[PDB]
Every structure is written in C-alpha cells, then in structure tokens.
Write a protein that binds this DNA or RNA. Sequence first.
RNA 1: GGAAGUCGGCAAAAUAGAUGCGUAAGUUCGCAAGAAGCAUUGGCUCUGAGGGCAAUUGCCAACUCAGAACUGCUUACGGCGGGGAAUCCAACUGUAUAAUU
RNA 2: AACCAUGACACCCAUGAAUUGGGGA
RNA 3: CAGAUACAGAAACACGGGAGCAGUUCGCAUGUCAUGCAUGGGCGUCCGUGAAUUUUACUGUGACCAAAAAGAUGCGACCAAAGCAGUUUGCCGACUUGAAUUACAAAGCAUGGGAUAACGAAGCAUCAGCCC
RNA 4: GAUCUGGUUGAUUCUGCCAGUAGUCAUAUGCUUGUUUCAAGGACUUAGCCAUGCAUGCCUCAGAAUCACUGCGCAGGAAUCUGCGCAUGGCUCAUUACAUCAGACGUAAUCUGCCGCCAAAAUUUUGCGCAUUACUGGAUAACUUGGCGAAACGCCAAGCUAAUACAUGAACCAAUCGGACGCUCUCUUUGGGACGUCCAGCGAAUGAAUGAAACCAACGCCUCCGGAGGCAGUAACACUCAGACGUGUUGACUCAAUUCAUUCCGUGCGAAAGCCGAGCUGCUCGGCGUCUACUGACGAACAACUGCCCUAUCAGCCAGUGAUGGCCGUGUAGUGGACUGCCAUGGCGUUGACGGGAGCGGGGGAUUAGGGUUCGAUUCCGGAGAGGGAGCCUGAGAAAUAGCUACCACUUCUACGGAGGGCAGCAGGCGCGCAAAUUGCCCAAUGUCGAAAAAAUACGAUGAGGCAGCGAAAAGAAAUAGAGCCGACCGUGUGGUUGUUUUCAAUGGGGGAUACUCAAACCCAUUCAAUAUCGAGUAACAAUUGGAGGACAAGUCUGGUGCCAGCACCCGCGGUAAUUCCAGCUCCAAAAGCGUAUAUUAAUGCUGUUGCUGUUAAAGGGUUCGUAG
Lengths: 260, 186, 72
Amino acid sequence: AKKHLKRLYAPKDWMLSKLTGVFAPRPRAGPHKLRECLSLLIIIRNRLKYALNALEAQMILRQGLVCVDGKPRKDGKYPAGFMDVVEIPKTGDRFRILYDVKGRFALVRVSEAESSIKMMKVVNVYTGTGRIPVAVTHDGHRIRYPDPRTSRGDTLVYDVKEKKVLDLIKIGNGKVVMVTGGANRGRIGEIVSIERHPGAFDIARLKDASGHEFATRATNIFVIGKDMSSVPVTLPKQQGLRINVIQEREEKLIAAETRR
Amino acid sequence: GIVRSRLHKRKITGGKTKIHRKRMKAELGRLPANTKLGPRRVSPVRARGGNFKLRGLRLDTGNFAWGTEASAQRARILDVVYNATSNELVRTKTLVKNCIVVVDAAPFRLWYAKHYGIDLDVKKASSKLKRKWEYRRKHHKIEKALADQLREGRLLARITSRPGQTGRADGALLEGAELQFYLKKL
Amino acid sequence: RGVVHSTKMRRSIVIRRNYLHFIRKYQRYQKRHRNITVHCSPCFDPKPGDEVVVGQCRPLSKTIRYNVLQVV
RNA sequence: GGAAGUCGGCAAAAUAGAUGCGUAAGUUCGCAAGAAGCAUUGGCUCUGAGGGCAAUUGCCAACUCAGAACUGCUUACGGCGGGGAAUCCAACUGUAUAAUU
RNA sequence: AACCAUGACACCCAUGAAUUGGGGA
RNA sequence: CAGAUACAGAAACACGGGAGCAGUUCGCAUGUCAUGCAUGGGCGUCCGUGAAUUUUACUGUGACCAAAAAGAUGCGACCAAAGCAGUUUGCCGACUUGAAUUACAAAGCAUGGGAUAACGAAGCAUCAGCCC
RNA sequence: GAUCUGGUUGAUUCUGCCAGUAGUCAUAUGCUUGUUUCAAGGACUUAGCCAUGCAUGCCUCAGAAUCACUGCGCAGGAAUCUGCGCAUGGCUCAUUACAUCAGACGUAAUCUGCCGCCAAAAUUUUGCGCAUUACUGGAUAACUUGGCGAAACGCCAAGCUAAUACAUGAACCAAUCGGACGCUCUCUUUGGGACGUCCAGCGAAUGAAUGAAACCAACGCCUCCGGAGGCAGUAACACUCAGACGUGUUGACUCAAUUCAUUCCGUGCGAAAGCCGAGCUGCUCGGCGUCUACUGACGAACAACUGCCCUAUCAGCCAGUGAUGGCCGUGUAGUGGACUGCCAUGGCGUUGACGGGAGCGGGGGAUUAGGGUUCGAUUCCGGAGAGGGAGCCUGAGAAAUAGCUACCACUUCUACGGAGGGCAGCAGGCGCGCAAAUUGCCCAAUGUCGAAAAAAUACGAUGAGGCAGCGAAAAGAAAUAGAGCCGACCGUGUGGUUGUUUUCAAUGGGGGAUACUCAAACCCAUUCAAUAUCGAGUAACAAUUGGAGGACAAGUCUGGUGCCAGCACCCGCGGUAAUUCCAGCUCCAAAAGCGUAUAUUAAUGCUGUUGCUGUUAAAGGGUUCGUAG
Ligand SMILES: [K+]
Ligand SMILES: [K+]
Ligand SMILES: [K+]
Ligand SMILES: [K+]
Ligand SMILES: [K+]
Ligand SMILES: [K+]
Ligand SMILES: [K+]
Ligand SMILES: [Mg+2]
Ligand SMILES: [Mg+2]
Ligand SMILES: [Mg+2]
Ligand SMILES: [Mg+2]
Ligand SMILES: [Mg+2]
Ligand SMILES: [Mg+2]
Ligand SMILES: [Mg+2]
Ligand SMILES: [Mg+2]
Ligand SMILES: [Mg+2]
Ligand SMILES: [Mg+2]
Ligand SMILES: [Mg+2]
Ligand SMILES: [Mg+2]
Ligand SMILES: [Mg+2]
Ligand SMILES: [Mg+2]
Ligand SMILES: [Mg+2]
Ligand SMILES: [Mg+2]
Ligand SMILES: [Mg+2]
Ligand SMILES: [Mg+2]
Ligand SMILES: [Mg+2]
Ligand SMILES: [Mg+2]
Ligand SMILES: [Mg+2]
Ligand SMILES: [Mg+2]
Ligand SMILES: [Mg+2]
Ligand code: NA
Ligand code: NA
Ligand code: NA
Ligand code: NA
Ligand code: NA
Ligand code: NA
Ligand code: NA
Ligand code: NA
Ligand code: NA
Ligand code: NA
Ligand code: NA
Ligand code: NA
Ligand code: NA
Ligand code: NA
Ligand code: NA
Ligand code: NA
C-alpha cells in the first residue's frame, strides 16, 4: 500500500541523477513488474528529450498522443516492459523496447509492418468455465483459443492492431533465445541443452554465436525463433554479442583518437 | 479484543516472551455461534475483504444425500443424537460438523417407490416406466440395515457442513460398516 | 536430512542435525546442533539412530513443520 | 468513637469445618507450620470415572470424587484455632505444698 | 618451602668413568 | 565382426495423449449424404515399470545477488573535494557514453579424489557357479 | 611507514607499568579570524511540559444548479449532495535476544480497491384494454420560516426540489446441450418417432462420477417380398452436426474443469431506466461511466534454514489456569495448542537452557603491513510509537491519534448549568543540562492525491519537497605582496645575502551595472568602455595560538622573586648567579588557525589464531583415577 518511490530505491537503468530531486514516479500496477520496466514519463522526458519538466509530459500524455499497444495511454506511470511497441503518430517514429547487450533497456526504431507484431511468452495454461483453454502471457494478456500444442515455455507471435495469433514457436535445442534476467540479460545464443532438477530451477546451457558458452536459469530465456535469420522482429546493434573488457577499452581509446 | 497471535504463549524452552508492539487487527478472533435447533435465524458477519458469513442460529432442515443411489432430498431434522467433542453439546441441541442426527425419511420413501416401484401412486404408471423398474430392479439390491430404517420412518444421518460458517445443515446417510459403528455405539 | 533422536510421541519423532561452524578469527571450527520435530506416518518405522529425509509442509502443530519420506 | 478504662486488655468480643493455592526469619535439618494470607461452599436437573458373575451379550452391588446448565440468599441449628515482632528463665515429656503458692 | 619452587604423552640429540636389577657370550 | 573380461550414471520391459505428418542411419489409390479441401534397418527422443542404484568438508569454473558508500574504466566541471556527462574550427545536425567489480556464514548445478569425517563389519554372523 | 622515546641503580643487564606521540563527518570549552566552494546542526539529559499560526483535499467537452449571485437566452459559477483519497509522506528510538533484522527460501494454507488483458444469451416488463413495447417511484440536502443555548467543530421543528444517493423492473427478436414424466398419438414386434408438461445462466453449499498410460445371448456388417450366411472392413453417437474435444495443469494435487441430484430468499449478479460530441419526432457514428464473474501485476499477512554483545557471587526450565504431541470440533481470509472437550506423557538444557545487564536491525563509518579493535539515535531498507495503558466503527486495507469511548497524571474558558486540550510534523517558548539555528519565501523542480493536460468570458491543494537567514562540526581551493635602482653593510672569495631612497608595473579585499541568475531575492561567473565607466606604499587593507633543561625543534641573553609566589601531563625547577616561575628581546613549530578536557583507535608481541609469559621477576593443581570435549 505504498505510494512513493525514493530516488535511491529506483532501478538503476532509469539513470536518474541522485542530485536531482528526492522522489521518482512509482509505476502503477499493470502488464509488467515494477523492477523489470520503465514508465512512460521516463521515456518521454529522459530517453527522448521531447519534454523538459514533468508537467510537459502531462501536456503530451493527457491528449493521447502516445500509444503503447495500439491504444493511446494517458497515464504517465504506465508500466512498459520488454517487447513493447511505442509509436507517436504525430512525430511518425516507432520504437520497440528490447534489452541491449549490457542488460539495459534499448529502444530500436522499427518499420510500419513490424510495429503491428509483438512476441509473447506463455507462463500458464488453464481451463475456463465451460471448456475454454486460455493461456497467460508475460505481459499479462490472455489468449482465448491458442494452438492446442502451446505449453509453458513456448512463445507466441501476436498481431496487436487486430487481435489474433500468427504462429507458435515451441522450445527445443535448435532454437535461438535471448536472456531476459540474471546479469546475462541481452545475449543471444542457441540452446545447447536444458537440465531438469525437478522441484527446483531448471538450468539451460546456451552457446553464443562467437562460440562462447554461458548458462542461466530456464526462467530467463525468451525464445525468439528457430534460427537467427528467421526473426520476426528487429534486433539491436550488437546482436547480443559481448566481448572482452580490455578489448572494449582499447577500441574506445583508438576510436576517439582517429575521430580527433 | 480476542487475538490469535503467538505472542502470549510460552517458548518451547519454557521461557516467557517479552511483548513489544500493541495488538493488531489482522489476527482478531470472534465469539462462536453455538447453533441450536429450531426455527431459522441468521446474522450477517462482515468478514475480511468485503464478504459475509452466515452465522447460523437454530437451523431447522437441510439437504441430505444418498451416496449409494447418488441422490439427495430435502428433509427435516428431528433431534441430535450424538456428538464426539462432548456430551454437553448433545444436551443443548447444538449443531456442528459430524454430528449424528435423525431425519424423517418420508421423502426418501417417496423417491424409492418412484425410482424402483417398491413401496414400504404406484399402480398409476405408464407402461414404459412399468418396464423400466424391472431393469433397475435386476441389477440393484438393497441392504436390510436400511430397508428396516425406511419401514420405521426414521433414518440416521451425519452433518457435513459448518453451520456457524455457511449457515446451512447438509449431510449424508450412514451406510455400511460406518452405520454399524454408530448402531452399536447407541 | 538428520538422525532420529527420540520416538516417544505418537506419529511424531525428533531428529538431530549436527554441523560445524567456522569462526573467522581463529581459523577453526566447532560442533553445533539443532533439534527439529517432525511427523512420521505409520508406513515407516524408524528406530533411534537411523537417518531420515524430511520435506517441508504447512504448519501441522505448534512446532511440527516437516514430514518424513524415505527412512533409511 | 475504639483501650482514652485499669497496677495490668481482667472480663467480654474475636478466630473457627472442609477443599484448591500459598507460606518468612531461625534451626540440633527433625522442625518452625494450621506460620502468615487468598478463593470456594445453598437448591434443582444432568454427565463422566472408579467393579463382580455367568455364557461380545445379559444380570447385579458400594457411595466417593470431578464437571455443566438453571435458579436463590435476610450470609441464617449444633460443633469448631485469634494472629504477629521481641526480652528474661527452665533444654524437652513428667512430678509437686489434699484445704490460699 | 605437599619443592626439582620445573604439568602429562611422543621424537632427535657429543663424550668418559661409576652404580642398582634382569639377560647373552 | 560378434562374444568375454572389466566398466557403465546404466541395463531389460513397455507408452501412438511419445520425436509442430511416429526423428536420424543403412501421386495413382482409400473415402465421398463430407471444407473428405484428408490422409496419399542400428542409434539417438519421450514417458512410465522392474534389476541396479553413496553421502559430506576442501578446491576450479559458471549460475543468484537495490542503491548510496568502497575500489576503480572514460571525459582539464579553470584545478580539487565533486558529477555522469559531454565533443564538433559549424547549423534545422553527427558521435554518443554512462564499463567492469566485491559479498561473514549458509544456500544451488555441475570437475577431480590427494589430506580429511559420516555410515557398515568383528568375519563359522559365510556357504549358493554359468549355459543348454 | 611493518619506527619508537623519558622515570627503579654508585654504575650494569632485565621484567614491568606510569608518562610522552598521531588520528577521530567526536563532543564540549578558550584565544584568534580577509575571500570563495561544499556542508552537519535539542539523539546523549527529561519518549520532560507546551502560548499562537500552518501542515490533505480534489471539477473535466463529458453525477446533480430557478443562489432574491455576476457578466451581455448564453456564459462564469458561491453552497451542498454524490464518487475517490486522507492506512502515503514527515518525526523519534521508549520498548525489544527462537523478538526484530540480514542472506536464502515458501503460501498445494490465504485475502487483495485503484491498474493491465478479458468475459456476459437466467429474469413475462411498460402503456391500451386483447392488439403494442423502457418517457419507473418515493424521499433527502443545499435554501427560508421560526428558533434554543454564555460559550462550544453545539442543536431543534416546519415548508420546497435533484441523482452516477436509494428502490423497483424490462417480454421483444435472440442460439447449443441434457434429465423426469404422460398409463396422451403413430409404426413394427424405452421398439422407434412426434406431441404435451416440469427443470436445465455466472457464483455458493452438500453428496456421486471423470480428472490414465504404461462357446453362447444381444447388438454392427457382408453376402446371396421374405429367408438364410458368418466375419473383409469398421474412432464413436438411432437422422437435422457421416471429427461440434476419446487428450487441463503441475516436480506433485481432495486443485482447474465437465455431467447429475437436492438447494441459495438477502447475507450476491445492469442494458446505471446515464453523461457528452457529432452526423443527419426518427435514425447512424464516436469519446466516456458503472454492477457481477475470472487471473496477472502493486501489495498484505503468516511459516520460518543459517548468523548476531557481557554475565555461573544465574543450573535446572515447562503442566491447576497449555507445557510437548494425538482425535473429531470451533474461530480466522487461511494453517496452527490460536481456542473448547477428551487422550497420552512429553518438550528444552554445560554445544550454556532459565534468569540478569547494556542495547532498535542492517546497508555502513574510524583506525589500518596482515590478522584485528571499535562505533552505527541519524538521510536508503525493515520494525515500532504518538503523555501513560485498553477497546472499537468505517473502509479492499487501521485495532488509525491533526478518528471515536472510558479510566490515571497534569491542564484552559465559564454566566458555576457546562464545554474542551495531546508539537517524538513545521517554525517557537520553559526546564534540563558541558552541550545544539528563523515564530522566513515558494509550489519553479522532484513526487502523491484527485472528478484534474495547458489556454482563455475561467490560476487545484501540498512546512512532503525546494530556496535563502544563523553556523570555524567537518571537508575542498586559496590573499597578507613581485621586480629592480643608490649608500651602508654581513659573512665568504666576488659571487645569494642582510637596510636607505626610490620608481614601476600588476592584482584582488572594498563599489557599481547594459546586466546575468532567480518562481522572486541572494551568492557565484562576467566588466571598469564597445563614442562613452572607481580605487594600497610607514600596502594603519598591520596573523595568531602555543613553546625554547630532557623526551622534542628552539637562548649557557637581561631584569624581579627568594622552598614564597608559581611552573611541572612524567623526570623535576624555586632556600640570593633560577638554562624551567613573572616579564623584555631573539628564536622554533604550523598557520586561519591553534591550545585545553573527556571518550576511543594505532602505538601494545601490555590479551598473543598469525603471535606472549609461568626454575629465581606475577603465574604448573599435593598425587592418582575419570566423563563430556
Ligand atoms: K511464629
Ligand atoms: K633395582
Ligand atoms: K491508537
Ligand atoms: K518542533
Ligand atoms: K590581513
Ligand atoms: K622565558
Ligand atoms: K608479557
Ligand atoms: Mg440437512
Ligand atoms: Mg487513667
Ligand atoms: Mg481473657
Ligand atoms: Mg525458609
Ligand atoms: Mg490456614
Ligand atoms: Mg520445665
Ligand atoms: Mg494448696
Ligand atoms: Mg558510488
Ligand atoms: Mg628495584
Ligand atoms: Mg530529548
Ligand atoms: Mg489505466
Ligand atoms: Mg440477458
Ligand atoms: Mg432473459
Ligand atoms: Mg533504549
Ligand atoms: Mg537513546
Ligand atoms: Mg525509516
Ligand atoms: Mg500532533
Ligand atoms: Mg555547539
Ligand atoms: Mg598532555
Ligand atoms: Mg639550575
Ligand atoms: Mg588501543
Ligand atoms: Mg608438581
Ligand atoms: Mg587440593
Ligand atoms: Na505429653
Ligand atoms: Na625443596
Ligand atoms: Na606450587
Ligand atoms: Na582524458
Ligand atoms: Na571545476
Ligand atoms: Na573523481
Ligand atoms: Na466546464
Ligand atoms: Na451538471
Ligand atoms: Na534529528
Ligand atoms: Na501506529
Ligand atoms: Na511530549
Ligand atoms: Na490520549
Ligand atoms: Na509541486
Ligand atoms: Na531542501
Ligand atoms: Na604491532
Ligand atoms: Na614467583
């Protein structure tokens, strides 16, 4: 029943200065968790500098200019998370919320056709009154009649402008995933195997594109496609490939030197 | 008020718990119901998270099921006959879960004659029903321990609800070794 | 896991857990222990001195919080 | 009102049965101890525990203890310790001037 | 000043004359 | 070649609600009152059932970990204590950054088996070929 | 930086403690202080007592306006009703050791407004009198008419009128599916079909079923009117639909979900019987608002594996009246000895229970060869409280203090009948003490609440929050002068130097804007012409605080006192020549700073795990046996 959020207690990925104000906007309940999201006021005022103060974001959001799932949103503290399309029809730009190679939020400009597509991760499958199989999704959507082959770990390709399911991508070794939590967030790799551990957390072993190996809990992977090429959505710049820290420092140093 | 916390009990070592903080509302209790037998009266209790419970005071009749025949029927409660917590609960004519009561059994005599054609309005019957009874009669049998009870018009049953919680008195007839348990017990 | 210590109750036993605690300053260990009471169904039959595996439950009493599986 | 009476609380008043709890200094470790002190107690209608003999059933005997609901008091035969803190003497039970010790 | 003012168990450690008890030549 | 000796998480027996059309390796015909517009020699999968069926501490590498503070990677805020920002010999813009760490003990996947400690035994308390 | 020095003897080598020494966002007091940047600030003692003022409310195009309200029917709308919030924030640390808290985990034992996806086929109603089909009812505020009462967040009666307050109630035209009957009709030999009647929506309670996967007699089919095969094929179901589920989920379910039987009466269910834009009584399109059912998120409560100072001049603790477990029960949202009845005799402890002392936990600070010692009221997270202590209403959520009720201690007004008060919120006062700031400005930023974007014929609140005043707690930069000239020189062998005259530039303390900042003011940062703008020379724009026997840098200087006065942290000095007192002159340290007091860290191998000592300096038990370890 808390209603505030102190600055120091806010997530670090919002990158709010500790010398500017004492409070942060608390995200209202909704599609995504408080820790794993960033609000609409943050995006409008901090990522793209459309608005300077927080009163100006109201002058944009209360008019319904900004849309987040094909429906305009007027609440600044709306929680927006992974794989979400943000479009401002007046300005004509559309972004998709993804994780960059360092586990931070990334907004990548998408095409017109892409902006109508969204990927969802199944989390639960149950039966309604009567016999209605409905599957819950990582962003909270409920799908009324999915493919009878859908299960917990798979993913769904969803059309947002008109509500129907495009295709279902199951789980298996061949597919390519993206890690969505655990300090390996933002890496793309293939499924080498998955370990069971009944009653506890499954461990999925993955192989990077550059031949590296990494592991994480099976509840942190979001299967994108059956191959790197066959990705329904766009990808960030690095394509989720992490390289050595000393090499990063050296490349940055020489690049600054050639630049000037 | 009444409290359900553990701050007043003794530790397993026998030590005495020192209490800081005052009493809280989340662990409150409430006084019981002591549901009697008679004309129906209930009171509404406002529970946690909206909602209401039916504090049953002097319920009269309820729905009693017949497991072997997969049937149920509405019947009246005559008197409480047995309790396991205490004898004092029987004397006060209180109703709680798992009491052993007595019921009229007149409705159940109606159902059996209608379903099977055996009476312990039968001659008036269509030929389709007059042929269906023999079908059921061939593959179904009944026990003397319950045939005698229906003849006497008094059936033993047991409560299967929480009258101080849901405000009803439902139950089921006693069949088999369980019935023979209480027959010897009385 | 633990060692069955006492079986004087009814459908209930006491198990002992022995472990070692490391003090940083002296770079050495020391024996400790903890006692835990659990519920034991009549399928099993443990004697004092055996080893048992116990899994968590919902509060079944003032102290009982574990249930016995696979006496050995 | 409460020992102001009187040499002196003399005489009177006062405590009181039973049950549950609780009980100090001192000590020769046995006691002191019923220390001190607190609570309950009627009537009526019920419930439980405590046994014997014949073939699980039947029949039969003794009043004791514990518990509950309702109901009532004008505190209501007889019989039945007042208590505590100290000083002097004699260790103690006992005997002993029938007729003033 | 119950004192060797010298806790108990185990290992290594240079020489020469004596002494108490058992054993071998 | 097989089998036979050792070893084995593993071995035998089954599941078509089991491997997005029952994995991998040596278009006539059925149906047509049809949207029937449909179907056209071993390994390794999966799930159950019986033989079998060792555990801990220590060490390597991963998993899992609010910020502020602390170490630090980059940038003359005139320096510094700071703060994450800022730089173009100019326009209706460009490059963008904000790295990466740690953690009393306990906890969790998997590697070795040297030093360790927890069980068992007290040996006549034991006797048990295999195949056809 | 892995450091040491003075005091036991006539001298020496030791043990050992006293004293010295460096820090401390560590407190206080003394002396002294030009500029600027960043900053803690009534915890310590008395969770002591408090005058006065303010701190939580909200209106859009979109619940409800006949203000005897205002502006030229239209607008703005005072006031009240209705909806949401006020359980957040802020302050303090009194209580507190199987408690709280930290790391790891759970709820298959539960509740959950606002928020996100999303669902809805039950209901015989209204007008006309049998044809039609959502223009439904009553009351109550605000107001005015009398008023009562010394007050007082005091209160009475009468007369009006609204709803997104309250209360009724919708056949229409709306599918699919299944049970029970009739002694109603038809056919052939439950047979089957039909016709009629009753029940069949979401949610709840009770009971039954599913919740899988390890040779004949009846029915189907074929072959050759009726009258005879004998098994090729063949998911099933007597037509209206020849596949309209033979397949939920979990690591695991008495869970999800389906069919059947008997039942819900207020303690549940709408198409708000509604609010704005348009477009064309009479229709179409678009923004809104609200009941009920379901599962995600923000949460709430509960269980808890491991860990956390000193004390044995604290050794046993727990059971009438719950202590440890069992059985049906009751209460709760839910499990539970949380609680009633009955039953058993258990549970904890030298691996320190029980009792006592200090104390809010943690993230972290100080000191740092390494190991450690110590502090943590305080800004982030968690818990708890609102003078003392208990109960409870309304809420989804409170056992709430700017909610109510009572008692206990202090306390205010009064007409003596009565009525009130709660600063450990903001600023301020008394007292207490060694000890701690203005009765300021603002919603510009950061956020919360809301019926709200901003703009107008039309400005939401907010001592949360921010800004400035006081402020050597502490921390970062940094002025108090730079070059030469001419004599007088000083030492050394001609090259720095020490005063005496005297120019010659430079710059800020100081003061002023074309002005910047600012929510408005202030401080920084710019600048003394851009035609066009003030200023050191005994630089009176003047640096202090401690010392000069040793430890320990610095006088065998000059006066005064005479074991007095005094210094001296320790050793010591002072009895007429004081290297130590009181002074003058020089000098030393560090400097806008520097002394003193108390506590604490390093010095300390003087607490020793790394790493001490025990013949004689303090210290081996009188000797054996012996259990836990
Ligand atoms: K006495
Ligand atoms: K000898
Ligand atoms: K309160
Ligand atoms: K104050
Ligand atoms: K000066
Ligand atoms: K002097
Ligand atoms: K020493
Ligand atoms: Mg009943
Ligand atoms: Mg007299
Ligand atoms: Mg007398
Ligand atoms: Mg005594
Ligand atoms: Mg007595
Ligand atoms: Mg005598
Ligand atoms: Mg005599
Ligand atoms: Mg930092
Ligand atoms: Mg000496
Ligand atoms: Mg105080
Ligand atoms: Mg919303
Ligand atoms: Mg309807
Ligand atoms: Mg209807
Ligand atoms: Mg305290
Ligand atoms: Mg304090
Ligand atoms: Mg706090
Ligand atoms: Mg107050
Ligand atoms: Mg001060
Ligand atoms: Mg000193
Ligand atoms: Mg001298
Ligand atoms: Mg020290
Ligand atoms: Mg000795
Ligand atoms: Mg001795
Ligand atoms: Na005697
Ligand atoms: Na001696
Ligand atoms: Na000695
Ligand atoms: Na640089
Ligand atoms: Na600077
Ligand atoms: Na820095
Ligand atoms: Na308006
Ligand atoms: Na209106
Ligand atoms: Na304070
Ligand atoms: Na409180
Ligand atoms: Na006070
Ligand atoms: Na009060
Ligand atoms: Na504001
Ligand atoms: Na501030
Ligand atoms: Na040292
Ligand atoms: Na000695």
